[PDB]
Symmetry: C7
Subunit: 68 residues, 7 copies
């Protein structure tokens, strides 16, 4: 996962279809991650900008690299 630090990513949660997008500032094996300039996406539509958020592994389905 460290290969995605300082990259634009999207974190998808288990429930609903919400995706947090931002820059991956940091993380840990535990999949606990810090996201900078995060923006909440629901079914692909922005529902706003949170600032920096710290997200818990458990709620996470997967992480992907947002496209260039």
């Amino acid at each position: 996962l460290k290969g995605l630090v300082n990259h634009r990513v999207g974190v998808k949660l288990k429930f609903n279809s919400t995706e947090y997008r931002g820059t991956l500032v940091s993380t840990d094996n535990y999949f606990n991650l810090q996201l900078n300039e995060a923006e909440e996406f629901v079914a692909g539509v922005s529902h706003g900008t949170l600032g920096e958020i710290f997200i818990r592994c458990n709620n996470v389905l997967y992480i992907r690299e947002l496209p260039n």
Copy 2:
């Protein structure tokens, strides 16, 4: 995460759309945290002040810093 100690944060839970906002007094890797002058928000509307609360990691979706 300790970077947020003494800051004004918002803890969002997995279920509903409830957020607890207050000052983050203390924490630990376990994402168990102490929140001072906590106020419970339901869909962004205040439903009251709790005092000092101690919140368990499992119920937390993420944490953010409340805009200054």
Copy 3:
């Protein structure tokens, strides 16, 4: 953590429903497994009775607060 709340009149809110157990926090441990004395069950803010000493399990706990003096 919680050790600061021992001997304090506390409210323990569960994840499900709107039930809060109020009592004196006798003891705890990192695991958020706690012993409440003089526990009184509250449903939607309404007393549904007094249990005695109860031993509650972290898991079901949403948060714990300090009841207003």
Copy 4:
């Protein structure tokens, strides 16, 4: 928790409104407990006697001491 051994206790489960009452034979930190002369109670009504049961922590909401 060992202060209740050999006491008449009630074990309340997470789901339903079922509680098992009996004599707490033994235990361990894990809240895995041994109940003797356990009787199942649904909404406060006896649904019969189990014998010895070994209960698992997880399903446990709380344990109380039954009125002498």
Copy 5:
């Protein structure tokens, strides 16, 4: 729990009202247990024999000794 080895027990699951009945061959702290000549019971009715099954703690609410 090893006190029930070689006894006739019932393993009740969290969900439903299924109980697996059989003879407790072996176990471990983890409540992972081996059942021999296991028979599945739904609401107290047999729905058939499984042979030997290995059951996982989690799915377990409790274990009881079947009346001799």
Copy 6:
């Protein structure tokens, strides 16, 4: 659990009534097991053959030995 290696088994899941049938290639205390020649059974009706599949403990209810 290792006594079932190379045996023909059925892995039942917590949810639905789905059982994965196949040969138990390997395992570990964690109940994470590798199945060969896995066939998906839904209410006792085959819905197709999977190849080799790796199953995660959590979703598992029990493991049984398919009658020789």
Copy 7:
């Protein structure tokens, strides 16, 4: 411990729904935390799109299988 599948075309089926992510398993570890490349989302057997490289958490995983070429 499921290192026999690396560089193999796999399917990751989640617990909930009937979604399977298909791709090449780049890397992993005991924890069943896995890295999938050229991942494609399949709902009831129908492609709903390509994701890039995605990193999947164990918990949501029901099982993994080898894709049949």
